[PDB]
Amino acid sequence: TIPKGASIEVKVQQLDPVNGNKDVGTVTITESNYGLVFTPDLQGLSEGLHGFHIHENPSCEPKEEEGELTAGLGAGGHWDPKGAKQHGYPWQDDAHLGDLPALTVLHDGTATNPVLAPRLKHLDDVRGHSIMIHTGGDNHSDHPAPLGGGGPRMACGVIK
Amino acid sequence: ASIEVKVQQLDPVNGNKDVGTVTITESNYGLVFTPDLQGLSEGLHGFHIHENPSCEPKEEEGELTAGLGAGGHWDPKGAKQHGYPWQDDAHLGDLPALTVLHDGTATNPVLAPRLKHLDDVRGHSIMIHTGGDNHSDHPAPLGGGGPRMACGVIK
Ligand SMILES: [Cu+2]
Ligand SMILES: [Cu+]
Ligand SMILES: [Cu+]
Ligand SMILES: [Zn+2]
Ligand SMILES: [Zn+2]
The neighbouring-strand residues paired with A30 are A7, A37
- CA of A150, nearest ligand number: 2
CB atoms within 10 A of CB A136: 18
Distance (Å, whole) CA A153 – CA A143:
19
From the CA of A96, how many Å to the nearest CA of chain B?
Answer: 15
Distance B28 CA to ligand 5 centre (A): 23
From the CA of B92, how many Å to the nearest CA of chain A?
Answer: 14
Whether A40 contacts A109, CB under 8 Å: no
Whether A89 contacts A140, CB under 8 Å: yes
Give just the sign of the alpha carbon dihedral A60, B86, A150, B145. negative
Is B82 annotated to bind ligand? yes
According to DSSP, residue A108 is labeled: T
Q: Which helix (H) or strand (E) holds A124?
A: helix A123-126
Question: For residue A141, what are the contacts with CB-CB under 8 A and spacing of at least 6?
Answer: A87, A88, A148
Nearest residue of B to residue A34, measured between CA atoms:
B86
Whether A150 contacts A53, CB under 8 Å: yes
For chain B, what is the radius of gyration of the CA atoms?
14
Is B32 within 8 Å of chain A by CB? Answer: yes
Domains along chain A? Answer: 1-160 (2.60.40.200)
Judged by DSSP in three states, A68 sits in coil
Whether A96 contacts A88, CB under 8 Å: yes
- CA of A77, nearest ligand number: 2
Q: Which positions in chain A touch B114 (Cβ < 8 Å)?
A: 34
Residues in chain B: 155
Categorise residue B123: left if φ over 0, alpha if ψ from -120 to 50, beta otherwise: left
Distance B42 CA to ligand 1 centre (A): 6
Is B79 within 8 Å of chain A by CB? Answer: no
Is A107 within 8 Å of chain B by CB? Answer: yes
Q: Which member of A49, A93, A114 has the closest CB to residue B28? A: A93
- CA of B84, nearest ligand number: 5
B113: amino acid identity, one letter: P
Is A35 within 8 Å of chain B by CB? Answer: yes
Distance (Å, whole) CA A126 – CA A124:
6
Whether A30 contacts A126, CB under 8 Å: no
Whether A14 contacts A42, CB under 8 Å: no
Per-residue HEC secondary structure of B40-81 comes to CCCEEECEEEECCCCCCCEEECCEEECCHHHCCECCCCCCCC
Distance A158 CA to ligand 2 centre (A): 13
Resolution (A): 1.7
Is B88 within 8 Å of chain A by CB? Answer: yes
Judged by DSSP in three states, A56 sits in coil
Distance (Å, whole) CA A5 – CA A141:
33
The neighbouring-strand residues paired with A64 are A69
Whether B40 contacts B100, CB under 8 Å: yes
The coordinates were experimentally obtained by X-ray
